[PDB]
Design a binder for this molecule. Sequence first.
Ligand SMILES: CC(C)(COP(=O)(O)OP(=O)(O)OC[C@H]1O[C@@H](n2cnc3c(N)ncnc32)[C@H](O)[C@@H]1OP(=O)(O)O)[C@@H](O)C(=O)NCCC(=O)NCCS
Ligand SMILES: CC(C)(COP(=O)(O)OP(=O)(O)OC[C@H]1O[C@@H](n2cnc3c(N)ncnc32)[C@H](O)[C@@H]1OP(=O)(O)O)[C@@H](O)C(=O)NCCC(=O)NCCS
Ligand SMILES: CN[C@@H]1[C@@H](O)[C@@H](O[C@@H]2[C@@H](O)[C@H](O[C@H]3OC(CNCCO)=CC[C@H]3NC(C)=O)[C@@H](N)C[C@H]2NC(=O)[C@@H](O)CCN)OC[C@]1(C)O
Ligand SMILES: CN[C@@H]1[C@@H](O)[C@@H](O[C@@H]2[C@@H](O)[C@H](O[C@H]3OC(CNCCO)=CC[C@H]3NC(C)=O)[C@@H](N)C[C@H]2NC(=O)[C@@H](O)CCN)OC[C@]1(C)O
Lengths: 176, 174
Amino acid sequence: GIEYRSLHTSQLTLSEKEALYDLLIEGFEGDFSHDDFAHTLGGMHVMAFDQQKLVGHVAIIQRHMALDNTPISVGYVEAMVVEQSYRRQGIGRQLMLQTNKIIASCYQLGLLSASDGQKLYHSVGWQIWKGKLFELKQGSYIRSIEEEGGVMGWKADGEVDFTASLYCDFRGGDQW
Amino acid sequence: GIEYRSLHTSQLTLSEKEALYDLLIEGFEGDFSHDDFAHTLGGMHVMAFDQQKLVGHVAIIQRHMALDNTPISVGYVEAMVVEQSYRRQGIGRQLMLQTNKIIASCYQLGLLSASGQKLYHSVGWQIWKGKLFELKQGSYIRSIEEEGGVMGWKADEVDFTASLYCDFRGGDQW
Ligand SMILES: CC(C)(COP(=O)(O)OP(=O)(O)OC[C@H]1O[C@@H](n2cnc3c(N)ncnc32)[C@H](O)[C@@H]1OP(=O)(O)O)[C@@H](O)C(=O)NCCC(=O)NCCS
Ligand SMILES: CC(C)(COP(=O)(O)OP(=O)(O)OC[C@H]1O[C@@H](n2cnc3c(N)ncnc32)[C@H](O)[C@@H]1OP(=O)(O)O)[C@@H](O)C(=O)NCCC(=O)NCCS
Ligand SMILES: CN[C@@H]1[C@@H](O)[C@@H](O[C@@H]2[C@@H](O)[C@H](O[C@H]3OC(CNCCO)=CC[C@H]3NC(C)=O)[C@@H](N)C[C@H]2NC(=O)[C@@H](O)CCN)OC[C@]1(C)O
Ligand SMILES: CN[C@@H]1[C@@H](O)[C@@H](O[C@@H]2[C@@H](O)[C@H](O[C@H]3OC(CNCCO)=CC[C@H]3NC(C)=O)[C@@H](N)C[C@H]2NC(=O)[C@@H](O)CCN)OC[C@]1(C)O
């Protein structure tokens, strides 16, 4: 074998963008919205190819969040997918190892919302976020109760309080 | 010549990041903070080279803002600089032309805070007419100083008279 490429959205060919969309719809068995695809664009993509065919993907989006009262730069992991017949071969793990490298070089903290999918992320050093989660709804921050226990975080240095509150920035669709 | 290269922050070595810092400090005559440099990192860099010598740069950072009540994905332009002896030759214009292409392919709106605005206007950018808000002490406040300084580029429409609420960061919010 599998070839891996790290490409910003601006560096994708039009062909690669359409393959990616198809891969995400197929890999999530349709449970992937237009908002979810919008969240996948604008940052870095790690893509896995079997020769010329796209078979795996993860994206890393820059988000601007607050850790308690402190601003933090976040590499937010979106749209992790491997084509069904290529699964359970370690592609997803390699995508995450490359993801960790990107986060370590650019952002203060990695974050993601898992599935069922937690064991893979835990195997490359990610941990469940234990503090409160907040999102903007109708103007002001509310608790993201549904997501608490599902969001996972990662720091290279490990020097971050996983019990602290996280306030995420405003976007369409699912905030996490 | 001048060669132009577009690299994500994760595609840069330590020396190239250091060359970028030095260019920014020199080009802004020291009026560029450690926070300003943090704002420069994490997105796309358009860089101009005379041979192996970095002589120009602009960054495009993804930001998540609200246009009035609606969320808007923003390519935010940071750290536009050309080395002093290379100015008034078209490099800044070419850096903005590459910037526009990146914004057009990734984001709904391009934004920046200027400091002359003629260059940006020459490449399609327009002064933002709506109120601007930033966070201070956890509550949004009129970015009164910024209003009239922030410019937008439509990635095309977006109503430039709507209120913009920027997302939270260290240092200057705009
Ligand atoms: C989640 C997903 C990307 C995992 O991709 P993957 O390529 O199968 O990932 P890996 O092969 O690295 O790991 C998958 C499993 O096979 C194991 N494995 C690792 N290397 C292996 C190898 N050489 N041979 C066999 N199995 C291996 C892993 O330990 C892991 O075990 P687990 O499921 O019990 O935790 C994939 O299942 C997928 O696309 N799901 C649909 C979309 C989705 O849910 N994305 C995640 C949302 S958070
Ligand atoms: C802002 C900055 C990047 C411009 O870079 P630049 O390479 O000089 O940009 P350009 O050469 O494309 O255009 C600048 C001017 O030179 C003119 N110009 C361009 N090529 C020219 C040429 N061959 N002959 C004569 N004039 C020319 C342009 O018409 C333009 O005129 P204007 O300012 O009245 O609009 C540079 O001044 C700088 O680094 N300033 C320090 C950083 C700063 O203060 N602010 C960051 C911007 S918000
Ligand atoms: C804590 N319980 C969880 C749910 O909460 C829900 O977690 C959602 C989460 O997977 C989504 O991330 C992945 O899934 C898809 C698309 N899938 C939804 C179809 O649009 C996009 C990116 C994926 N991530 C990666 C790394 O690839 C998050 N984007 C949103 C999470 N939240 C919700 O959907 C609800 O709160 C809706 C309220 N607005 O799933 C599983 C769960 C354990 O039961
Ligand atoms: C509208 N009047 C303006 C002021 O408002 C102020 O505009 C600031 C603006 O240039 C800054 O962007 C540029 O400057 C630097 C370095 N900046 C100085 C060292 O930190 C970083 C990136 C630059 N942009 C690009 C595209 O490269 C913005 N980041 C912030 C703007 N606001 C302020 O500085 C003050 O309101 C608060 C400061 N505590 O100066 C210029 C002005 C026209 O007079």
